[PDB]
């Protein structure tokens, strides 16, 4: 016939048991039935935001038809999913699509109200290519159709609710986003199905952890789809681990084939100890793989591993390298930002609270306001944080808050409202965080901004969400919102002597209370207060800058030894307590980098030998021996 | 034909005589003949508000063509009219506006220039997505186009005076709204057609009554459109009254019925003392003074460049001063919503004036606008309320002198804000204890003269020169304010009867309610909030517990120091 060709039954496959279990939805299937046998405005249409199981509700409907839990007026019914494109794919001539549609209508009338029609994505069949919708509309306006639709509320509004001639033939069967416990039950039935697929084992605490983690972190997709995708990708992971070997041996396998290819490319090293140690570690872990002869269940830790490698938040197991790297994170922040104990204390404790799970899941991680005069390393600390956490200085959301000195460059940092010029390019902040929900946001020098940008930062540091101009919402609640300032510079440089840290913090906090919004300062996590550097701190910073100068000329083909008196010349010529550690850098730049490059471009200095930077009387001299 | 797709022949029906016998607007037809008989730039445009009979102007020109009442260059023409609302609404994609447009142009080139076209809404021609200025502007300069434009001056200068090349061809013809008597002349020219349609007669006193009342009460649609609408619908109503199951002449009574639904003016002005005592007890002399001032403003003897009435108010505040302004706005123009409460307590600087009148351009409150003049511009028939005028900066009184002299005020944005349709109420309390402590047995007039001398020593004499009359606002006694409390109890019982409860009261409870918040120093609103907070809050506490039933008699019986509600 025609229904045997251009429609696809669902009740046969539910009768053949090919369709998935559908759990819950009792109120929704009941109101589906209620609208389904309503005399006027007969045809229901499901409204569900994408994923909440509209197609699952119609599959469960056909499964209850086979189960006979429908009323007696609905037994013997058939559900024929009308395939929109399968009508189209042969209609090369004129009106042959319309002939197919009219013939489907004639055979559906011939079935005489014993067949329910299922049209998924009804907004596609608003106009499906006069063409389709106005052709069905008389068969709508005769009561002689059992059409069932399912579309997301955006499309039912903007394609169907516009046409008031159609609203008198449909009915808002509004599916809701399911609760987490309904998601637990759905995942238990689908756990049975997926363990029958993969031949694996899934634990019920892993179910409830997948539900809670999926609800908490991935703010984009909607339930219960994201929990199913967690479970299914984790099952693929466990079956692959059973298949070849565990992933630590695969880490070492790809590492030694990497060093194999790069060793063959070398036919200076930094290479021998790595390759030897990892061949030894591969032998040891291959021996342990033989000794345990592994992972063959699904714990919640596997769910955390899938979720971490999907979003980017480190939700996974805190291995020993993380604990060592974290106490070394205190140590390494003092390896790159020497001095300024309070800031390293605050940020270290913040990230340690975040990895320990004690962070409040309704705010961002730790939102710091930095104070203190210029070049005690405010931006250097923020670069140290990003270059710890992501191992790059520019791997961070740098927002230079001195470009926003108009009221209306909030359009830059958030987005264009709709219809305007650059609308479909978002903001800088909002886009770059919705790409990467775990990253460090440096609002650089916040006190230069126009004061109604602090509204946006109030919403951020209030709840870690933000409404950009494209309507959506951002999940800031895995970010570190660090701001810098120097608003007590005269005061901090005045009274860092003879005042303890509490009185200093309270006094400059009062000055900041004069500057900022008093709404805003209380919403901050923690205001750490800095101090100008002493000469030994500046000597340490000089040693660090001289390390990177040695690295710059080690690239070129030169080596440097420095004397011991000349570092005192740097520490005294490049010193005042008023402008931070930058007169050190200017003094280094002049008193070393000008005569050195002057003599190198002369051709005077020679590669291969040692540039012994010794002293003049009141200058610095280079030699070559 | 494509002429049988988007054009309308009016020489067709005018040769048949089957259009309006258009009477009036001869000079606009004459200037249309002036533009159309030029060699070049032969596309006149009509300018006016929509509904001034521009289609009738074109049809009357067509009737003068059929009658031969035109000079010998306008003859043999065909009156056409092109749609500007289907060439775009049918236009799906690139070139469906332009396709139809060039098809119209070539099919009129077949017509060889013996065709006059009409186009309304010339602003629509500019913006449709380019579209038609670049394709009619050659025909605008070729002279082969014989268009008749029709739009309004504001859209004309918003869209069309942007491009001066489009501006230089069309010739502006102002078609204003006709008068009431011109409407009478047109309807007398058209009473014959109505009476030949419905086979009835028409009362011409009802015609002039309909014209006058349509001019006064309704400003949605305008002349002559609203008169045609009211006459035709009233004739329909009379026709249904005849053919229901008896007069053929439509009366002005049906005009007033369709007017108010779909006269109490003059004697309501005459009975204005009773009107002020419809809701306000006490202040009898102030009522008489306000009513006499209203009637003298309606007497039509004063300056036509000066407002309704200049006033300064004194005495104890909150006793019904604002309530007088509310009832005055009610029985003056509409209701209790055409008024602007303004505190002069704030304004004490130069940027105070920049706030209240309007900022200069480039500054802080510019399109936020003046605090007074914008609210006047929104509500042109209101009553202006001022509070504590002694707390004003002295240069604000220069603005007040401009109000009371010219009746108009240029705001910061630079336009005219007319004041000859409002009431300037300025309230103060400088002679408070002069009236309060000497309320006993001292007259209205000499107390007025005494506090007039006091405020004369306070304010500027030239300022109070412009003031017509300063009423006293003597402090009302306990009986008047008790009666006001009774009226508040009445409207409270009205709202609770909307909720549906039979509620009574004890008279001792009424005395305690009258003695809750009585105070001669503050006003009546302390008594209002006192009675309000005493009664309302335990009431709903008793209600939503599940105690009170709609229909039970609720006597407000007294406690020893409180009032208890009973359910009987």
């Amino acid at each position: 016939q025609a229904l045997k060709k251009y429609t696809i039954d669902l009740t046969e496959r539910a009768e053949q048991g090919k369709l998935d279990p559908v759990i819950g939805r009792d109120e929704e299937i009941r109101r589906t039935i209620q609208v389904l046998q309503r005399r006027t405005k007969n045809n229901p249409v499901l409204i569900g935001e994408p994923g909440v199981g509209k197609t699952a509700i119609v599959e469960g409907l056909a499964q209850r038809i086979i189960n006979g839990e429908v009323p007696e007026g609905l037994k013997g019914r058939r559900v024929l999913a009308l395939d929109m494109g399968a009508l189209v794919a042969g209609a090369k001539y004129r009106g042959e699509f319309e002939e197919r549609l009219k013939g489907v209508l004639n055979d559906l009338a011939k079935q005489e109200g014993n067949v329910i029609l299922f049209i998924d994505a009804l907004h596609t069949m608003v106009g499906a290519g006069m063409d389709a919708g106005n052709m069905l509309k008389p068969a709508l306006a005769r009561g002689e159709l059992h059409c069932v639709g399912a579309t997301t509320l955006d499309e039912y509004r903007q394609y169907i609710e516009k046409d008031a001639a159609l609203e008198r033939r449909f009915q808002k069967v509004f599916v809701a986003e399911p609760s987490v416990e309904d998601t637990i039950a759905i995942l238990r039935g689908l756990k049975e199905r997926y363990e029958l697929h993969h031949h694996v084992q899934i634990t019920d605490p892993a179910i409830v952890a997948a539900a809670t983690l999926s609800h908490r972190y991935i703010a984009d997709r909607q339930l219960p789809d994201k929990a199913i995708d967690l479970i299914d990708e984790a099952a693929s992971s466990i079956r692959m681990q059973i298949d070849s070997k565990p992933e630590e041996l695969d880490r070492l396998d790809r590492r030694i084939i990497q060093l194999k290819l790069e060793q063959q490319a070398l036919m200076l090293d930094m290479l021998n100890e790595e390759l030897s140690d990892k061949e030894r570690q591969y032998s040891e872990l291959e021996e342990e793989w033989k000794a345990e002869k592994l992972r063959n269940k699904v714990t919640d830790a596997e769910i955390a591993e899938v979720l971490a490698r999907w979003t980017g938040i480190p939700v996974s197991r805190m291995m020993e390298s993380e604990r060592e790297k974290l106490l070394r994170m205190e140590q390494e922040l003092h390896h790159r930002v020497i001095g300024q104990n309070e800031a390293v204390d605050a940020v270290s404790n913040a990230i340690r609270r975040s990895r320990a799970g004690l962070a409040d899941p309704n705010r961002p991680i730790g939102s710091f306001l930095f104070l203190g005069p210029t070049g005690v390393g405010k931006t250097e600390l923020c670069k140290a944080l990003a270059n710890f956490m992501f191992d790059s200085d520019e791997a961070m959301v740098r927002i230079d808050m001195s470009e926003f000195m108009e009221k209306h460059s909030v359009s830059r940092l958030v987005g264009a409202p709709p219809g305007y010029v650059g609308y479909e390019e978002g903001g800088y902040l909002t886009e770059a965080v919705r790409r990467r929900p775990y990253s460090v946001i440096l609002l650089d020098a916040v006190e230069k901004a126009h004061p109604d940008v602090f509204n946006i930062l109030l919403q951020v540091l209030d709840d870690g969400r933000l409404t950009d101009g494209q309507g959506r919402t951002v999940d800031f609640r895995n970010t570190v919102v660090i701001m810098t300032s120097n608003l007590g510079s005269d005061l901090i440089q005045e009274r860092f002597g003879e005042l303890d840290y509490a009185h200093m913090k309270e006094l400059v906090l009062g000055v900041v209370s004069h500057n900022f919004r008093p709404e805003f300062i209380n919403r901050i996590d923690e205001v750490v207060v800095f101090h100008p550097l002493g000469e030994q701190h500046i000597a340490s910073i000089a040693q660090i800058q001289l390390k990177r100068l040695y690295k710059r000329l080690e690239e070129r083909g030169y080596e440097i030894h420095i004397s011991d008196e000349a570092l005192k010349l740097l520490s005294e010529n490049g010193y005042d307590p008023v402008y931070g550690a930058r007169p050190l850098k200017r003094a280094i730049q002049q008193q070393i980098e000008n005569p050195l490059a002057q003599q190198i471009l002369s051709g005077e200095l020679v590669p291969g030998k040692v540039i012994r930077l010794e002293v003049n009387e009141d200058r610095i001299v280079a030699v070559q021996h | 034909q494509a002429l049988k797709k988007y054009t309308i022949d009016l020489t067709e029906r005018a040769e048949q005589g089957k259009l309006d016998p258009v009477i009036g607007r001869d000079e606009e037809i004459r200037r249309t003949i002036q533009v159309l008989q030029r060699r070049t730039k032969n596309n006149p445009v009509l300018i006016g508000e929509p509904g001034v009979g521009k289609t009738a102007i074109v049809e009357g020109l067509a009737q003068r063509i059929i009658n031969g009442e035109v000079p010998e260059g306008l003859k043999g023409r065909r009156v056409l009219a092109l749609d500007m609302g289907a060439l775009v609404a049918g236009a799906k994609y690139r070139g469906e506006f332009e396709e139809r447009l060039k098809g119209v142009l070539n099919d009129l080139a077949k017509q060889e220039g013996n065709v006059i076209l009409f186009i309304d809404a010339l602003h629509t021609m500019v913006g449709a997505g380019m579209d038609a200025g670049n394709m009619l502007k050659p025909a605008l300069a070729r002279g082969e186009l014989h268009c008749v434009g029709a739009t309004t001056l504001d859209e004309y200068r918003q869209y069309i005076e942007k491009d001066a090349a489009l501006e230089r061809r069309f010739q502006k013809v102002f078609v204003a709204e006709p008068s009431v008597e011109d409407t009478i002349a047109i309807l007398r020219g058209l009473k014959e057609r109505y009476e030949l349609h419905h086979h009835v007669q028409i009362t011409d006193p009802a015609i002039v009554a309909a014209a006058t009342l349509s001019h006064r009460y309704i400003a949605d649609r305008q002349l002559p459109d609203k008169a045609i609408d009211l006459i035709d619908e009233a004739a329909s109503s009379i026709r249904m009254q005849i053919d229901s199951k008896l007069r053929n002449k439509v009366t002005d009574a049906e005009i007033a019925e369709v007017l108010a639904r779909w006269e109490s003016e003059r004697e309501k002005l005459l009975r204005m003392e009773q009107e002020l005592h419809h809701r306000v007890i006490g202040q009898n002399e102030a009522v008489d003074a306000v009513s006499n001032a209203i009637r003298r403003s309606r007497a039509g003897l004063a300056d036509p460049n000066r407002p309704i009435g200049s006033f300064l108010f004194l005495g104890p505040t909150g006793v019904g001063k604002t309530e007088l302004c509310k009832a005055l706005a009610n029985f003056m123009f509409d209701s209790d919503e055409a008024m602007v409460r303004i505190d002069m307590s704030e304004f004490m600087e130069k940027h105070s004036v920049s706030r209240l009148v309007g900022a200069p351009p480039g500054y802080v409150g510019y399109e936020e606008g003046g605090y007074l003049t914008e609210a006047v511009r929104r509500r042109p028939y209101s009553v202006i309320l001022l509070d504590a005028v002694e707390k004003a900066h002295p240069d604000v009184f220069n603005i007040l002198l401009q109000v009371l002299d010219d009746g108009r005020l240029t705001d910061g944005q630079g336009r005219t804000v007319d004041f000859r349709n409002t009431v300037v109420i300025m309230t103060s309390n400088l002679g408070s204890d002069l009236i309060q402590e000497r309320f006993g047995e001292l007259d209205y007039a000499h107390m007025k003269e005494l506090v007039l001398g006091v405020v004369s020593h306070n304010f500027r004499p030239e300022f109070i020169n412009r003031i017509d009359e300063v009423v006293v606002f003597h402090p009302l006694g306990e009986q008047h304010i008790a009666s006001i409390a009774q009226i508040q109890l009445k409207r409270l019982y009205k709202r609770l009867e909307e909720r549906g409860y039979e509620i009574h009261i004890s008279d001792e409870a009424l005395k305690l309610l009258s003695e809750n918040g009585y105070d001669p120093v503050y006003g009546a609103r302390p008594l209002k909030r006192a009675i309000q907070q005493q009664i309302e809050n335990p009431l709903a506490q008793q209600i939503l517990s599940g105690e009170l039933v709609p229909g039970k008699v609720i006597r407000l019986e007294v406690n020893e120091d409180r009032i208890v509600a009973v359910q009987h």
Partner: peptide
């Protein structure tokens, strides 16, 4: 035997305009 013609599909955009303010 009809062939579905590819369309022209004219589009649209807009543009705001700020306004600074002196602050006397």
């Amino acid at each position: 035997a009809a062939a579905a013609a590819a369309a022209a599909a004219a589009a649209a955009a807009a543009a705001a305009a700020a306004a600074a303010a002196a602050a006397a």
